[PDB]
Amino acid sequence: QKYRLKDLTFLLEKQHELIKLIIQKMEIISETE
Amino acid sequence: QKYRLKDLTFLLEKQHELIKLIIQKMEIISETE
Amino acid sequence: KSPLHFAASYGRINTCQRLLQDISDTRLLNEGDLHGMTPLHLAAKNGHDKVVQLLLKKGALFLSDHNGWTALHHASMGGYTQTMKVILDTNLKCTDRLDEDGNTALHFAAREGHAKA
DSSP, X not given: OHHHHHHHHHHHHHHHHHHHHHHXXXXXXXXXX | OHHHHHXXXXXXXXXXXXXXXXXXXXXXXXXXX | OHHHHHHHHTTOXXXXXXXXXXXXXXXXXXXXXXXXXXXXXXXXXXXXXXXXXXXXXXXXXXXXXXXXXXXXXXXXXXXXXXXXXXXXXXXXXXXXXXXTTOOOHHHHHHHTTOSOO
């Protein structure tokens, strides 16, 4: 289960990077400040 | 593994905040109610 | 009605500012959905303090849904200390409200384990 937890961590980090990319590429028009 | 689990929790919470930001900034036009 | 509930529930603030224009009819502001939850209830449930502040600046009365909860009940169930602090500086009379089971906001904040709340 330690091995499983390490794999889980790795996947979560990849996912976090993808989400940051989404935020930095999206369109923002009506909700701009 | 307790330490690893705590780090996992922290990262997941940061990610949740980012997702809520996405929802509150995005564009919604065709799928509006 | 349907757009305002979504915009308030997900913290989309500019949509709220646009919808709440020509302030004269407060029927849209203080109207709940099928569970009786007004926009204030939703904005506090998801923990969006700016939307709560904006709605209070128009006055939202602190009603109650189909379980007796108030905005403070939801904000405490979630643990969002910031919207709680925003609420606790207005009427200062909702602190000791009771739902259908005589639970206060403190009951929920303690049951869920939110120490700062």
